[PDB]
Amino acid sequence: ATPWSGYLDDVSAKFDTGVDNLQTQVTEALDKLAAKPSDPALLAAYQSKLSEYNLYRNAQSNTVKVFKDIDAAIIQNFR
């Protein structure tokens, strides 16, 4: 059936389903810019997508780390 998925997987995937298609949009913007690097409207378009992508990946991974640290501290008190 569907592959198994924990709690951290879900907290991660809430971003991949929140930013609807940014992962495609960035590759489209790069394929258009590489065609003619000297178009102001293309450079202006690409700057925004690249910045948004950067921030998205940062917020995702920092949140996964924080939850992994809240869990390990409880698991340690079982002993």
């Binding site: 059936a1 569907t2 495609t24 949009q25 489209e28």
Partner: protein
């Protein structure tokens, strides 16, 4: 597609089925003529059991 076959004495075949199909999303297809040239077929996913 992924499947598992099971044989029933009634001569019936039973399967657990998952199917994914489609074109990959290219919503910014630029020219009208490219869309006219290539059929849009929506990304679809199905999961079920049937005999």
């Amino acid at each position: 597609i992924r499947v598992l076959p099971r044989f029933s004495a009634d001569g019936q075949i039973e399967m657990s089925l998952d199917i994914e199909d489609g074109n990959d999303k290219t919503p910014q297809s630029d020219t009208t003529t490219s869309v006219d040239a290539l059929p849009e077929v929506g990304r679809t996913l199905i999961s079920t059991i049937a005999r």
